[PDB]
Amino acid sequence: AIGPVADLTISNGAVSPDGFSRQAILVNDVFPSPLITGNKGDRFQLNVIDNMTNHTMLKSTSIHWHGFFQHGTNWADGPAFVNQCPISTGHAFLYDFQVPDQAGTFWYHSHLSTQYCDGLRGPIVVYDPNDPHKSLYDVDDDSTVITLADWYHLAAKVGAPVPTADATLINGLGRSSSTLAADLAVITVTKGKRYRFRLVSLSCDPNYTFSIDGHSLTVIEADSVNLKPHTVDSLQIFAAQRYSFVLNADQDVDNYWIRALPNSGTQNFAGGTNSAILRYDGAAPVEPTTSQTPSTNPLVESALTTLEGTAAPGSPTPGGVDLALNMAFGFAGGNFTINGASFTPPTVPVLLQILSGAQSAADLLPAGSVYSLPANADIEISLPATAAAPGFPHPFHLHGHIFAVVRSAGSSTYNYANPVYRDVVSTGAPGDNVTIRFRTDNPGPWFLHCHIDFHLEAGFAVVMAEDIPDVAATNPVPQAWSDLCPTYDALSPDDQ
Ligand SMILES: [Cu+2]
Ligand SMILES: [Cu+2]
Ligand SMILES: [Cu+2]
Ligand SMILES: [Cu+2]
Numbered sequence: 001a002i003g004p005v006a007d008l009t010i011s012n013g014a015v016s017p018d019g020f021s022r023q024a025i026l027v028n029d030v031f032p033s034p035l036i037t038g039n040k041g042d043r044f045q046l047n048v049i050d051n052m053t054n055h056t057m058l059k060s061t062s063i064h065w066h067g068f069f070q071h072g073t074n075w076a077d078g079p080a081f082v083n084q085c086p087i088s089t090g091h092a093f094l095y096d097f098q099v100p101d102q103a104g105t106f107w108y109h110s111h112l113s114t115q116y117c118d119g120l121r122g123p124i125v126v127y128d129p130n131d132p133h134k135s136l137y138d139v140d141d142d143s144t145v146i147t148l149a150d151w152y153h154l155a156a157k158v159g160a161p162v163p164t165a166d167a168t169l170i171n172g173l174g175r176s177s178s179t180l181a182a183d184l185a186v187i188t189v190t191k192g193k194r195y196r197f198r199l200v201s202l203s204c205d206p207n208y209t210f211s212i213d214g215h216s217l218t219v220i221e222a223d224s225v226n227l228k229p230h231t232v233d234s235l236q237i238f239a240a241q242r243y244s245f246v247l248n249a250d251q252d253v254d255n256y257w258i259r260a261l262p263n264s265g266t267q268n269f270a271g272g273t274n275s276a277i278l279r280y281d282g283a284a285p286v287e288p289t290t291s292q293t294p295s296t297n298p299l300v301e302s303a304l305t306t307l308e309g310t311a312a313p314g315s316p317t318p319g320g321v322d323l324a325l326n327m328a329f330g331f332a333g334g335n336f337t338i339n340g341a342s343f344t345p346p347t348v349p350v351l352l353q354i355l356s357g358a359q360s361a362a363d364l365l366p367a368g369s370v371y372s373l374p375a376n377a378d379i380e381i382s383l384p385a386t387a388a389a390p391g392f393p394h395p396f397h398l399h400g401h402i403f404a405v406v407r408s409a410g411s412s413t414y415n416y417a418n419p420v421y422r423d424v425v426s427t428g429a430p431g432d433n434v435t436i437r438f439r440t441d442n443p444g445p446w447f448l449h450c451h452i453d454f455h456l457e458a459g460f461a462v463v464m465a466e467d468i469p470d471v472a473a474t475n476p477v478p479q480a481w482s483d484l485c486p487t488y489d490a491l492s493p494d495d496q
Contacts, residue, residue: 001142004038005045010061012054018167018174019182020153025119032172033122035145040103040128049092056157057118060086060496064111067224067423069400073097074444074475078111081345082447085484086112103128104224105198105242114156114453117204123147133220137246140196147171148260149202162454165265170276177266185276189249197247203239204453206262210235212278213256213290217245223422226307235299238395240424240451253280255288301408309418312404312437314378316416322377329389335459341368342459350445350463354471361465375467377440385432397424400446403438443467443474
């Protein structure tokens with residue numbers, strides 16, 4: 001795969017991943033966006049060259065590298081109007097950052113409006129030559145990356161505000177109810193071998209219930225965090241989450257269905273929709289005729305644990321931290337709210353505001369949406385589910401961090417001893433009180449929001465301004481970053 005040094009040229013073109021042709025966003029002239037890889041310790045140098053001409057899908061762009069801490073490089077995180085101004089068409093921008101202490105499965109996507117839905121999204125893998133799980137599998141390569149994506153026949157700004165997907169794409173391919181003879185993705189394995197499959201949700205909205213006929217899945221990673229191995233027969237993956245699982249190809253040589261059931265839209269597999277094919281070497285090139293058996297051992301988040309059984313930060317009791325925050329969701333006026341405020345992008349990016357002198361949350365715009373966080377501190381955030389926030393379950397994501405999930409959705413228990421750690425978590429349904437903990441070791445403004453992009457567009461977000469007084473000194477910015485704002489602000493509205 002390309003990387004860790006590469007050019008990413010963004011353009012517009014026609015695509016047909018489900019047999020229906022529509023204009024979309026291409027990356028290096030292809031759809032879906034290409035896999036980028038590197039190795040632990042790498043410095044990534046990704047030059048984003050924006051050549052887009054379609055205003056409906058936005059000519060400007062900004063890319064987030066999902067899951068990377070970006071310590072010292074807050075300016076390269078990606079969220080438009082939080083960490084940068086967008087890159088303007090006809091221009092390029094170098095994202096230069098290092099990943100010294102992480103490895104695993106990640107992804108990249110536009111972080112400007114709902115643009116990633118239009119096609120700017122792909123997988124990233126950072127390999128570990130000393131992976132603690134390397135003995136569990138024989139094959140881990142470009143062909144073991146599996147992506148899941150929602151696809152729409154109308155563009156993000158053309159269809160409804162919260163549209164319903166027309167197809168599920170697996171590795172960029174799938175059928176729609178309108179298409180049924182479209183090509184399906186094929187994942188090939190050789191009997192007797194063990195594979196590390198890296199499952200990445202590039203979803204704008206739906207969650208997927210994933211399973212493979214006749215095979216169990218041994219989960220070993222969640223959102224770039226190494227787990228104790230946990231075997232399941234199905235798993236639910238929310239928007240932006242990642243899981244690595246080992247598959248032992250020990251069944252009979254044949255074709256097996258790979259299934260990804262969405263929580264909305266077409267909720268079945270008729271005609272081969274929401275599916276792909278697991279093909280053993282030797283099997284005829286036909287569709288599977290296997291059947292799905294009931295899942296009796298589904299993945300349960302509260303049962304996952306980190307490889308080392310790391311405790312949650314803080315003391316083992318509710319509120320046992322330095323700063324506890326509660327996020328109260330709401331919806332009014334067609335906009336989502338958190339503690340009464342709806343996020344709207346400011347004219348001046350939050351980072352630039354800080355660099356320009358703002359020293360407190362009350363000095364930062366947008367008002368009421370920014371939270372100051374103390375340095376070197378244990379933080380707890382509770383995100384209680386409520387019907388007052390339609391479209392639940394909302395998968396919340398915190399930038400610049402991994403966090404411990406001390407209470408998961410569908411569970412009433414709290415685990416401070418060995419909870420899973422991850423970066424995207426479902427907040428569940430009314431009755432739930434998903435709670436997370438993390439330590440503030442990364443100065444800068446970090447986005448915290450629902451990863452259903454249509455909800456983020458409707459304001460479902462806040463900014464965590466971590467250790468404000470140290471932001472400038474910790475994150476020196478390149479001249480090219482400083483140039484983004486004047487360039488963007490000079491554009492005609494038609495060229496945004
Ligand atoms: Cu993301
Ligand atoms: Cu992120
Ligand atoms: Cu949401
Ligand atoms: Cu984000």
